Amino acid sequence: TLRKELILSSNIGQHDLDTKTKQIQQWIKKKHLVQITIKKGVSENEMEEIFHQILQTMPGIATFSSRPQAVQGGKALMCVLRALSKNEEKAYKET
Amino acid sequence: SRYSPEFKDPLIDKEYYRKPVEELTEEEKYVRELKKTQLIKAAPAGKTSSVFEDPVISKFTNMMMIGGNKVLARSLMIQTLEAVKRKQFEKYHAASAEEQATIERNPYTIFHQALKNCEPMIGLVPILKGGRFYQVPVPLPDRRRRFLAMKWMITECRDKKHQRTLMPEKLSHKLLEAFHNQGPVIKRKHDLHKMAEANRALAHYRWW
Amino acid sequence: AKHLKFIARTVMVQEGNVESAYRTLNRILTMDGLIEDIKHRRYYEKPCRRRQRESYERCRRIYNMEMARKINFLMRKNRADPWQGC
Amino acid sequence: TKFSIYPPIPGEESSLRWAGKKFEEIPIAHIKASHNNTQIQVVSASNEPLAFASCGTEGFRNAKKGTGIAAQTAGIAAAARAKQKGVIHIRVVVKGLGPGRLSAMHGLIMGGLEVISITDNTPIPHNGCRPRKARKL
Amino acid sequence: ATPSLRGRLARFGNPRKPVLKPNKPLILANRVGERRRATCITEMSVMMACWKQNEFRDDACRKEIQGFLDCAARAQEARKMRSIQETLLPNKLNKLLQRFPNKPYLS
RNA sequence: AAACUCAGUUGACACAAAAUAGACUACGAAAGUGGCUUUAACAUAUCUGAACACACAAUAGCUAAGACCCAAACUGGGAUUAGAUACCCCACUAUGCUUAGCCCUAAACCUCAACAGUUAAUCAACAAAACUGCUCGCCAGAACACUACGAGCCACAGCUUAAAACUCAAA
RNA sequence: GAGGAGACAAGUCGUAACAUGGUAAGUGUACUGGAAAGUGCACUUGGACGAACC
Lengths: 95, 208, 86, 137, 107
Ligand SMILES: [Mg+2]
Ligand SMILES: [Mg+2]
Ligand SMILES: [Mg+2]
Ligand SMILES: [Mg+2]
Ligand SMILES: [Mg+2]
Ligand SMILES: [Mg+2]
Ligand SMILES: [Mg+2]
Ligand SMILES: [Mg+2]
Ligand SMILES: [Mg+2]
Ligand SMILES: [Mg+2]
Ligand SMILES: [Mg+2]
Ligand SMILES: [Mg+2]
Fold this sequence. Notes:
The structure is cut from a larger assembly and holds chains A, B, C, D and E.
Chain C: E1 10-12, H1 18-32, H2 34-41, H3 47-74
Chain D: E1 28-33, E2 38-43, E3 49-54, H1 68-84, E4 89-94, H2 100-110, E5 114-120
Parallel strand pairs in D: 1-4, 4-5
Antiparallel strand pairs in D: 1-2, 2-3
Helix pairs in contact in D: 1-2
Chain E: H1 41-54, H2 62-86, H3 90-99
Helix pairs in contact in E: 1-2
Bound molecules: magnesium ion (12 copies).
Chain C binds 2 RNA strands through helix 2 and helix 3.
Protein name (chain B): Small ribosomal subunit protein uS7m
Family (chain B): Belongs to the universal ribosomal protein uS7 family.
Keywords (chain B): Acetylation, Disease variant, Mitochondrion, Primary mitochondrial disease, Ribonucleoprotein, Ribosomal protein, Transit peptide
């Protein structure tokens, strides 16, 4: 399992966010562990909304290997996305 | 340095000055005549003409010194020598005449030979080719070899594994082991040699 | 391949000094340009780069030969100053 | 006769001999000093294989193979095998400017075998095939 | 003999395309370039192989160890002698060229 | 690391490319041309003369049929990286090769037009010294703009010719 | 409706160019890529190769 790390900003543009979301989707398809960190360009809730927005584009593809956590003295948020297992994907399909 | 560059270190050796004049080559006579008109540094308070003076033991005492406690360092050195001599005498008395011929009782010889056995022939130095440093093997000059042997002895004696064991006894035991080619100091020398051999392939990284 | 073996690029060691034999062989290859040719043929040197390198080497050789000629010409004038003081 | 660096010519009547054998009958120690691996195969005067030794076969791996030390090890192993298989003097033919080029000969001698001739057979095309493109680092 | 420079550079009165394209002018400078800057590894290899096959017991490797030490001392001595020998020199040659400078202009 | 279980010697074997010579400076209008042999063959006894026509024009590229050792856009895999749609490693295709047509572009630059002449009284700078006569081609602030429109063309994401508006005091 | 250019004009993702700009740069062309751009083939120096021998 290869770990791909990304660093984003709270005030990231929508176009750049889309580009990085496409890259993250490619990583998930490749079955890598995507460690996304978000820094202040803002509130922690608003920053975590970015993680939620990113994962929205992967409804039955990606999930949170590790949930959002405040790191770097609370300055940054961090999370780890992973591809859904076979069993999780089957459960999603059944749902 | 309070001594001007014109000052030369003194040569404290009775035989050198008592050497017959006829035995002096032209260069030696020139050297003496030149020294007749050269400023000389005052003799340091460490070395004298005493026939019992030993530079190696003096340097070992200096290395063992902590915070300018020359008295204590000399005390530890003499206690170590006395302990070594006592242990060798005990072995000599308790041993049969067949091996008494080989049993050594001279503590100074024992110390010299122990340090010589501890001396490492090859060391590891960082050498850089292209922008990366690697622990390349390299010969160690004589000064570095002697210093490494002495420092390994002192550090191994100073280790905390030996608890409530005074430095005299610790150092005497380690010196005897080194003399007989055993003990942690010789083990460290062998570890250095083993690492050098393991990195033998990097010898060419040296440029000098 | 279709030639006889052990005639081309073969040197005979004298008294067993393979180091001397290899030095002689290396001098032969270098003077004939085989070492440089192999080093350059390791990777494909595109024709423009080859032409530029050849031109640069020609200019370097011209300059070095002229400078060596000048040095050898003036070397005699390295004598002791005959009119020292005045 | 005086020593001449040129090898004796086959068919020509020559007084040179090594272990009672002519030059054309001496075994040949083919060395191949690739960029990162040195191979050494000692064959007879009739291309009958006798010994083989390579940096890779000597336990060296990855970059360690392309070093003079590995080449010496391979040369010593090949020399030992050839010695036990009945080889004293050899004509050395090396094709490659790798790091093991000369270290292979040094090891091949330190292993006992004597060298009578050193041959360079590095394949130098008169162009022909196109090599791979240059590297930009 | 120096290679000919007649009709080599792109100049007026040179119908042929240039043969040479020197980045710097082909005019001798009044100075020459500065002098541009392991040892005894076989004895080391012998000593280390003996150590490897003997368990690093120097007592029975004494001969190889003494050879290695003597060779290292000789290496240092060679460094010293080479340094003193190195010390025609570029400085003297530049002095000579200054005495006889290249005059690419008129006077 | 991935990749192949292929690797060494020897012998047979190209529709690919053409060490050394070449430190030569030649041939051709330019593009180009440096393995060998042969055949054919290198216009003009006065110069200049195409957006106004004819013939060419490297590499890339298109169409159809062959060759395929090696190299190799793209693609795939390894590695690096925050990422690496790159640089580094491996595999392989179009493509480079031959034939018949297209395509008509290059930092196609020696950025220095052809012809004739001079070296004398120099010449912004640099570059490859300064000029004279004659002829054709071209240029007239930058950007818009190797652009839009129009036109021509085997070109259909193209090439050639090629503006204006808005903007600025610069470039 | 949409495109193109220019300007006003503060941001987002990179750091492509200027130093050998960290893979020298660029021309033609082909494919590819948020994006500057990457790569192949040929070409240019509007780069250098340190300018006696080492
Ligand atoms: Mg005409
Ligand atoms: Mg025309
Ligand atoms: Mg064409
Ligand atoms: Mg193909
Ligand atoms: Mg051209
Ligand atoms: Mg164009
Ligand atoms: Mg157009
Ligand atoms: Mg149109
Ligand atoms: Mg950059
Ligand atoms: Mg660059
Ligand atoms: Mg390019
Ligand atoms: Mg690419």
